[PDB]
Amino acid sequence: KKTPPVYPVTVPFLGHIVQFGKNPLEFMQRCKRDLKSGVFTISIGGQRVTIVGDPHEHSRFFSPRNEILSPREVYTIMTPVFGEGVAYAAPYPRMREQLNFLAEELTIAKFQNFVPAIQHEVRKFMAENWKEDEGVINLLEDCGAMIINTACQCLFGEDLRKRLNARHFAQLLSKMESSLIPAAVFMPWLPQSARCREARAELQKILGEIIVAREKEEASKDNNTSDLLGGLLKAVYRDGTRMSLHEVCGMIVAAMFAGQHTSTITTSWSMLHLMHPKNKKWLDKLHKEIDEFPAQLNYDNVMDEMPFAERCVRESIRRDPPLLMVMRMVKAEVKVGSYVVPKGDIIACSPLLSHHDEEAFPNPRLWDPERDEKVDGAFIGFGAGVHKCIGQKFALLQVKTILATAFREYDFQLLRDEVPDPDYHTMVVGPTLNQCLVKYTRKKK
Numbered sequence: 001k002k003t004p005p006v007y008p009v010t011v012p013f014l015g016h017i018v019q020f021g022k023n024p025l026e027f028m029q030r031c032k033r034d035l036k037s038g039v040f041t042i043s044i045g046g047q048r049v050t051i052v053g054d055p056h057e058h059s060r061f062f063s064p065r066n067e068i069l070s071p072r073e074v075y076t077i078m079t080p081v082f083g084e085g086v087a088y089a090a091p092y093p094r095m096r097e098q099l100n101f102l103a104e105e106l107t108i109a110k111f112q113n114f115v116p117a118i119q120h121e122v123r124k125f126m127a128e129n130w131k132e133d134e135g136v137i138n139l140l141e142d143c144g145a146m147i148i149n150t151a152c153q154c155l156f157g158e159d160l161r162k163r164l165n166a167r168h169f170a171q172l173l174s175k176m177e178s179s180l181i182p183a184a185v186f187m188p189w190l191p192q193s194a195r196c197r198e199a200r201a202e203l204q205k206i207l208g209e210i211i212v213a214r215e216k217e218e219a220s221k222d223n224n225t226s227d228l229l230g231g232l233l234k235a236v237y238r239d240g241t242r243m244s245l246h247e248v249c250g251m252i253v254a255a256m257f258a259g260q261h262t263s264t265i266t267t268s269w270s271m272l273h274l275m276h277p278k279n280k281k282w283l284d285k286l287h288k289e290i291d292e293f294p295a296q297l298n299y300d301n302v303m304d305e306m307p308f309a310e311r312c313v314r315e316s317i318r319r320d321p322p323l324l325m326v327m328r329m330v331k332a333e334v335k336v337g338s339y340v341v342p343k344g345d346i347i348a349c350s351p352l353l354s355h356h357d358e359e360a361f362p363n364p365r366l367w368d369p370e371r372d373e374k375v376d377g378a379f380i381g382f383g384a385g386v387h388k389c390i391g392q393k394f395a396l397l398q399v400k401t402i403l404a405t406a407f408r409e410y411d412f413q414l415l416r417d418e419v420p421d422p423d424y425h426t427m428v429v430g431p432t433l434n435q436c437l438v439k440y441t442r443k444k445k
């Protein structure tokens with residue numbers, strides 16, 4: 001009944017925040033290698049951080065209930081972004097209720113409209129920015145613009161898009177997230193909240209006026225508005241109450257924030273690999289898959305006739321996962337294989353680490369869409385168990401739709417010799433900005 005072997009500190013109360021900041025992959029790999037164990041504890045400012053680095057031991061982290069493993073006290077940082085009483089700020093039972101309303105808005109039933117709506121905004125963006133036949137663009141900043149555009153074309157109603165467009169909304173999103181610093185998640189003890197508040201107090205009033213307007217159309221039942229907002233208004237809790245504007249806006253914000261960073265990074269990655277000359281066989285097999293498709297794609301095409309595309313996307317999330325660390329706070333310990341994690345200990349599971357386990361993924365730095373996890377449950381890019389990703393189906397659909405639409409009508413050339421190196425400065429990891437310069441070439445008669 002002993003604890004994981006603690007990696008020693010040299011500079012004290014720095015813990016490892018410097019060695020970790022530069023390159024998390026190498027650091028964690030070295031820790032795993034030296035300690036001869038996938039399971040080990042590191043110190044971050046004195047805090048006992050315990051990583052579960054053995055892909056065979058994943059279900060230990062993802063299976064327990066919240067009362068045993070609590071995300072809240074480690075994920076608090078998001079409380080100003082979504083507001084109070086929303087998500088973690090709210091108690092677990094009612095957060096579950098909140099998440100149920102959101103998940104019931106991303107049902108495969110809603111997805112029938114999404115495919116044509118995503119294609120519309122991709123082709124709009126390509127008509128206004130891909131204007132020349134040959135041009136240089138930054139892929140990372142462009143896929144983001146496409147992700148926010150198409151996501152608003154899916155879950156935002158006509159009237160809401162007239163009173164808010166995506167391009168202004170993304171400026172509200174960045175206005176809101178800038179209060180996040182990676183080194184504020186382990187210390188329980190704001191110069192940006194002042195700008196964070198004014199963004200929500202702006203969005204909340206805009207939404208409130210759309211609601212005031214929709215209740216004055218509601219008389220006809222002819223308004224027929226069934227978007228993310230439309231369903232969240234109708235939401236009724238277990239105890240008869242309904243969502244207030246504060247809880248409503250927070251939910252919309254969360255819906256967009258979650259998808260926009262993770263999806264755009266995924267898309268960008270996916271495009272850089274296929275674009276690369278070493279990956280030509282994969283680009284061809286992609287083409288073999290999408291060449292037969294009509295100009296206007298339907299739900300079946302993307303979902304049913306596009307497995308290989310999904311193999312590329314998933315591989316991209318397997319190789320370079322957007323979220324490096326998933327975290328919990330232990331309230332009551334349960335055995336982790338042979339070791340045991342004590343109460344008060346901060347337990348983590350790292351998609352960045354696990355996705356690079358030689359047994360699970362031989363040659364982890366190789367992009368290979370046809371490869372299958374050699375250990376069941378190794379791939380945890382969307383998480384697993386109690387807190388698996390509810391946006392997984394939508395993001396997959398979103399990225400695939402974009403890839404199919406882009407490659408069908410364009411060719412791409414990477415100004416670089418090698419695929420961009422990930423940037424670990426940010427908490428959510430994507431490829432380097434100044435490395436993401438790409439040349440586009442339009443396909444002609």
Ligand code: HEM
Nearest residue numbers: 255258259262263266326381382383387388389390391395
């Ligand atoms: C590539 C795209 C995405 C990735 C990589 C991703 C990744 C993840 C991961 C790793 C988790 C687990 C969090 C944890 O256990 O600590 C998660 C949970 C979640 N994701 Fe995503 N996600 C993606 C897209 C989306 C989208 C589009 C949405 C919503 C639109 C979304 C909403 C959520 C939500 C609500 C959770 C709930 C976590 C919980 O149950 O407490 N995600 N996602």
Ligand SMILES: FC(F)(F)c1ccc(N(c2cccnc2)C2CCN(c3ccc(C(F)(F)F)cn3)CC2)cc1
Nearest residue numbers: 075087099182185254255257258259262323325326427
């Ligand atoms: F809808 C929702 F319920 F409010 C919600 C939305 C997004 C998320 N997350 C999320 C983000 C991007 C894609 N998919 C899901 C996060 C919320 C907190 N989270 C993390 C993950 C890591 C870190 C840290 F410490 F590394 F910076 C901080 N927060 C992981 C899931 C969780 C809940």
